[PDB]
Enzyme design. Sequence first.
Site, PDB file in Angstrom:
ATOM      1  N   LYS A   1      19.711   5.276 -20.124  1.00 51.96           N
ATOM      2  CA  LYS A   1      20.663   4.705 -21.092  1.00 51.96           C
ATOM      3  C   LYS A   1      20.261   3.302 -21.440  1.00 51.96           C
ATOM      4  O   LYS A   1      19.043   3.191 -21.723  1.00 51.96           O
ATOM      5  CB  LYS A   1      22.072   4.794 -20.544  1.00 51.96           C
ATOM      6  CG  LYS A   1      22.391   6.180 -19.976  1.00 51.96           C
ATOM      7  CD  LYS A   1      22.128   7.357 -20.931  1.00 51.96           C
ATOM      8  CE  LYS A   1      23.005   8.587 -20.553  1.00 51.96           C
ATOM      9  NZ  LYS A   1      22.756   9.047 -19.170  1.00 51.96           N
TER      10      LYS A   1
ATOM     11  N   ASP B   1      28.359   4.015  -9.546  1.00 54.91           N
ATOM     12  CA  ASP B   1      27.556   4.372 -10.709  1.00 54.91           C
ATOM     13  C   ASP B   1      27.786   3.296 -11.773  1.00 54.91           C
ATOM     14  O   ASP B   1      28.872   3.216 -12.362  1.00 54.91           O
ATOM     15  CB  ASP B   1      27.940   5.761 -11.207  1.00 54.91           C
ATOM     16  CG  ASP B   1      27.045   6.246 -12.339  1.00 54.91           C
ATOM     17  OD1 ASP B   1      26.442   5.401 -13.041  1.00 54.91           O
ATOM     18  OD2 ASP B   1      26.954   7.479 -12.529  1.00 54.91           O
TER      19      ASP B   1
ATOM     20  N   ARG C   1       0.824  -1.204   0.000  1.00 52.63           N
ATOM     21  CA  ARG C   1       0.000   0.000   0.000  1.00 52.63           C
ATOM     22  C   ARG C   1       0.864   1.263   0.000  1.00 52.63           C
ATOM     23  O   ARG C   1       0.387   2.359  -0.315  1.00 52.63           O
ATOM     24  CB  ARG C   1      -0.936   0.004   1.212  1.00 52.63           C
TER      25      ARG C   1
ATOM     26  N   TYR D   1      30.838  11.195 -14.028  1.00 50.49           N
ATOM     27  CA  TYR D   1      29.899  11.882 -14.900  1.00 50.49           C
ATOM     28  C   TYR D   1      29.816  13.356 -14.507  1.00 50.49           C
ATOM     29  O   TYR D   1      29.785  13.698 -13.317  1.00 50.49           O
ATOM     30  CB  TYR D   1      28.530  11.210 -14.801  1.00 50.49           C
ATOM     31  CG  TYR D   1      27.471  11.833 -15.665  1.00 50.49           C
ATOM     32  CD1 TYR D   1      27.537  11.735 -17.048  1.00 50.49           C
ATOM     33  CD2 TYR D   1      26.389  12.502 -15.102  1.00 50.49           C
ATOM     34  CE1 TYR D   1      26.559  12.302 -17.860  1.00 50.49           C
ATOM     35  CE2 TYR D   1      25.399  13.090 -15.910  1.00 50.49           C
ATOM     36  CZ  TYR D   1      25.494  12.977 -17.287  1.00 50.49           C
ATOM     37  OH  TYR D   1      24.533  13.537 -18.097  1.00 50.49           O
TER      38      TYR D   1
END
Lengths: 412, 414, 413, 414
Positions: free
Chosen positions: A226, A201, A64, A117
């Site tokens: 990606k 990552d 829930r 990144y």
Amino acid sequence: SYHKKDIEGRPLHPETQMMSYGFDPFLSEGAVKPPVFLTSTFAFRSAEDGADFFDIVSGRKPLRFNHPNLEIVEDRLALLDGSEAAVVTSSGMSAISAIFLAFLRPGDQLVQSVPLYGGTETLIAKYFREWGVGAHSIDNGLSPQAIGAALEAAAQQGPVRLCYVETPANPTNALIDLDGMRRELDAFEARHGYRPISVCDNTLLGPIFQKPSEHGVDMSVYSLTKYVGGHSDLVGGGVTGRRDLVAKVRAVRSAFGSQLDPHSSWMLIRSMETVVLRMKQAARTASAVAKWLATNPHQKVDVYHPELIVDDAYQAVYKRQCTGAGSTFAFVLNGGRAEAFRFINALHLFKSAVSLGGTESLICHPASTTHSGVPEAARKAAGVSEGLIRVSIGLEHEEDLIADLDHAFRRS
Amino acid sequence: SYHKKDIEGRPLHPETQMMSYGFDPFLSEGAVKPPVFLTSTFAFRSAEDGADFFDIVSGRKPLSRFNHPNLEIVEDRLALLDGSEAAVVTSSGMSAISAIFLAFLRPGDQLVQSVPLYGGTETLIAKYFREWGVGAHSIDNGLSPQAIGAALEAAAQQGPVRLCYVETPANPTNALIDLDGMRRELDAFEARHGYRPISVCDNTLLGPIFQKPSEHGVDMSVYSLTKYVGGHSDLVGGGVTGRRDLVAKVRAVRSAFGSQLDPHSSWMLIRSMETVVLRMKQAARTASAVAKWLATNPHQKVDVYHPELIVDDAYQAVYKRQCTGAGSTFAFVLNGGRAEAFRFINALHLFKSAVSLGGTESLICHPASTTHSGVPEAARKAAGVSEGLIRVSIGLEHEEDLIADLDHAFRRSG
Amino acid sequence: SYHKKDIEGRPLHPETQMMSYGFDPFLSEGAVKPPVFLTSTFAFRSAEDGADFFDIVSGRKPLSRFNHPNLEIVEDRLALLDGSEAAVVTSSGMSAISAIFLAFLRPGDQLVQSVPLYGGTETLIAKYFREWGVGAHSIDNGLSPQAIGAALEAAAQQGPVRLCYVETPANPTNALIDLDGMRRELDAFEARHGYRPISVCDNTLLGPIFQKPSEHGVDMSVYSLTKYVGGHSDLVGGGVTGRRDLVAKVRAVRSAFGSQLDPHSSWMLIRSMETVVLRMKQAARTASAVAKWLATNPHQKVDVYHPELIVDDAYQAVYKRQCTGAGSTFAFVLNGGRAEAFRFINALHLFKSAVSLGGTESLICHPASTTHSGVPEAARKAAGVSEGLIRVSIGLEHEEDLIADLDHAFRRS
Amino acid sequence: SYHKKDIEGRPLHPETQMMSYGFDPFLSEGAVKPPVFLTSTFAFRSAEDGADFFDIVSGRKPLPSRFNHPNLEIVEDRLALLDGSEAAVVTSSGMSAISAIFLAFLRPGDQLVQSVPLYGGTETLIAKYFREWGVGAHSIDNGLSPQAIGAALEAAAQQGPVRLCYVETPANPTNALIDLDGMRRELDAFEARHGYRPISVCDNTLLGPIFQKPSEHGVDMSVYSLTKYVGGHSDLVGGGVTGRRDLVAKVRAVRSAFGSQLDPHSSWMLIRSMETVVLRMKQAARTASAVAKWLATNPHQKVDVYHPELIVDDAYQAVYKRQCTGAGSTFAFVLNGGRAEAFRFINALHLFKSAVSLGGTESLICHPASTTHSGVPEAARKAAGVSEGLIRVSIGLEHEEDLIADLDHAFRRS
């Protein structure tokens, strides 16, 4: 009963699991695919239920509470990379942000691999640095001593909350030694009595070709935009790992309003039915395109594809933590920006864009795009040179991609 | 420039084309995928343009504003996949088949058909178009060119033979129709009578990747895009490919009867077609291995109606020349009847009990009690449907898992 | 329990029912809106379950597994909006009309029709179904019960009268068919011939909010849901409502010819119907004001074919009796023929030049060269579609802005 | 030409603008509605184009739109038009929009002034997350008292730089008001004393953008949960921030850095929604007035009705008359019997759905002390007028006679 991981003792393959795991068709009228709940508003059967619901959500009473479409995505994503739990967010960056917001506090230190990144580096160096968070870089991701040194340097300035690495790195496919990182965090924990949370990552290779949870990494973060989505048509992020840590990220996601939307969730489920098929195909093609580049009859180029990097330490890490090379890699033309620009402009099948991991092949020149904000000196030390070209191989036939690159060499 | 078919002279592979063919990103602000036009209402630049537009559409003046942008991409790519000049997509396989019948049949017309056809097509022929005055004539043996000629002659005795409608491979036995022999019999028919029936192939089981009727002189192919091309058991859609002038008549009917595919499903189709080559080859790979395993399984000898395991010489000569793969739908026959088939199916964990085919998930059904339960026993015999026959449609699951599931079924039902 | 039609004895208003009727949130995890089933593939729990299902489909065992969940909600609500027993939705207005013709026509059958019809309908009758052996017979004056009886008699001279197909108000003149007189003429026909033509009303211009043909004994209504019910010029869909046995025959044709509406468009339709009452009344209010301004505009005297501005006694008695509002599509006639009509349309900035109707945006077109350019010129002229006639379909824009746009067009033309 | 704000001198009404503003059909093949770009990947025409793009994106070269998604841009132009702002940025949710404002401007040691009560999610961000990052908050005691606003600012400035003045008016669930003009003048006097100005932010979800435009009263930025009235159909989640261009630009940069852009499909739903936002909000407001008036005089039990039109105080009405052009459709009323009676009443209704959202097509009802405001301490809850007897309704598009009959039934069954 709808989370069955095996058959007669042998575990099911991931591509088999992505068609049913976490979904019981007969609780949805027999529909073989999950219906889309295009709403966030779910009514209570009674006011007492509404009060009971908020007692549990807040912790005033012990357990829930998930959107139906997000739960199926999260179950399947955690299964794909061997994690206990998962939370999906609106984007790769909001997934990374939720991790930082869940764990960092003023005075905290983090260790990071280099390079990250650009958006991650921006969060660390611009936003969280100003919120009082210090960052300390691992000098050499292949050197366990350099990882330990970064951890000790961080511990001098405050509590080391996170050890955040990104492997392989963009665009050189440089590697971080995950097993060495785990052992250095073990020794750190033995010295200081606490353990930094480790995060990887895992966008370039995961979840099919690399599973950080098998190497003691606490959490993996993904830009589902990606490979997992894989069709350049939805934005989404995912965090997988240990249940208690993912639970803190889920709390931040709810507090900062970072949920993935139901329609994109439906696309993700559809995408995950072919993620195994797509990632292996793209990786096969990229392997062939890279080998052709490495011996092309036109011009000697350096090829930064994991199977073409000869260093012993690199291959020992690669063989140990990766089961494929992915489909994103770079090569370096002789000459500078001018030659690279003429090369890119001659191609017909590679599309010029900074994204990666789509069904279509993509190409870009990092020094003038993804890495154009970095000073020329820092680019050169990071191996991003004016001749470097990055490709992200899609599902096109390798003979057509090779013919496209062949035409580019001639017309340049 | 947006329809490039080759590179330095050599033709591009179909999987490469499915990411760009017929779409120029820079006429859509550089978007690497086509935007979705969720509208059918397109305004005119001037009232004169509107009058000119209707002058052309109606044929009042001789000649793309006449196509929905997203449907045009699906149709260009679909025609490319199967080697056709042109294509038109509809709301469903049944409305595509309907459009062909409505475009070409008239009262008094005759058609030749193969047997068995999809149940919905057979209902169109035997109920609706028979009541509209269309007679049908069945090919006795689709592997026999002489039987094809005889059906054409019997049809011509009763009226103009407008259509020759075949479906190969057939459901559920994967029986074949000799497409080259049909072409030669239609050549000889045309020589005798001075007109040629339009030939149509329902190409759903194998096409467009493993069979291209247009390479064999078939005028049109029809597809339930709902199955393999969509491939994810969500969208519903139909396609007709073939000669441009015939496709144009089908298109005119599609507009008059309002059976266009909707844009959202067109966007889903475009997405699906980016993986159609990969998905269909993978499913066929697994099905070949699953079929071979059934054929020698240690639990009970079963007949396996998979194209690579059917040894008849005439069948294999036809298969080798007109097919480049066997698809992923096939049937096998347990010993016994409905009771054994039901225990087998209920013991499976990975196959879902449903009547569709060509999804990412593997599907299984018992035709005698489902798809073919409404036909008389005679029609079951003609389609090869017995009480022990089980049809599977293999998806993208790993072959080792499907085999283990089937192995478990044999043990738990034996 | 989820098909409750009233509260404390008194029936709920339609705008209230469009937020709940036919949907139980607690059968869908408490979701306040119905989830979208983007699939047509529904699995059986067992092989026996599959055999039982087809036992029911084939009639071997007497009887929701036989409807798509999202299409069922659309159909329940649509039949509720127009007071019909039942409804079936299709891929488009034209496939809904086609399903009716394919369900009921046979070679040699005759039909009676009003004029003018939607261009696409006229093409189905005069080209395709004529080539299949169906004849059509026109009602000369839809306000004349004598003219309706005459067309029925002319039709029977050539064969069985299977259908009496009317479209009221007519597109684009807002001409009317007397529905009560049509029922009475069909009663008398049934007494003379011993069989009764099925009556069908294309209810797109006014329905389901401003006209309910089922209240006047019409057997079926057909809708282009693409127009008002959808209302956002962003989906295509058709609906047939009416008597349960007739809708069932249309549904069998719909399935046999593959004309199902897709689930995504069904979800958009459910979303749209939550404002259909609100949107249709707003557009109707604005159209009344725009038509009144056109009827007395300061530039040029023009005839306005809007139901509130057509003063004829027979017209108004029919209108007051069977309509509760005038819709938002109407026409006006310039004196300058096609050339001036073209100059007018081209000068507008807020009305989009397109052939659709009933969107959120206002639309304008010249029927003689577009929507009705496919009809022979004689039938066009005899139905009042003249070279000076311009059709507008008012959307949700503010009436003062639409009037200013028309005012500018008069000047710049 | 696609951003035309007037016609022959008079400005277009907002309901008119929501069908065309910011979109040129003839740059999209005549499509009368904007196509949906279901992608975030836009390719460059040349390598030189890509370098030029990032020259601008980073601020190395000024902008001479390629830097906005086509569908988000139309939503943002139309939202800023609706509430009279220079600029707008849309995010994935109301909470991610509010978060982006906090992340763009707050630093450790910063103080903010807030109104009370705030939305529970906002109160959690301030008192839990940003409190742990070193941000202090100070509450305005009486939003109708300029002296109380200035006192809160002065108290805040004692402890650090006052970065934000964040108000939510009308307040959820009491419809208490902040005097926006009085807030602007207090920030003028504050700026005169301290030499810097806190940025003012108004959560404008309950009345905006149709019934309240904070930009007309000197508020620097408005934030919206587009999930409520603007979407209006309980089926999409989205946030919006509108206001001065330089401030929105800083919020937009944060949105990009933290990855909180709205997705294309939800943007297309938003564009569709905004075509009826004027109609829907005015209708819900009409019904809400009639339901509130009936509650104030119902024959069953005297209840306090906290609807702006029923609050008789002079200061309240002067503020409301000056900054609101309507009352919205969310309001509260107070039963005598505390939580137990409130629960019996809510459980007896058939047309109101028991849920915590607001501004849907369906009318909703909840008990704030145990749901929406259960996370704020009871002491802070009670002082803000959220009591155990308070019930919040949000009126949708149902007919008023049906909602009134439903509430009538609830009173009897209690």
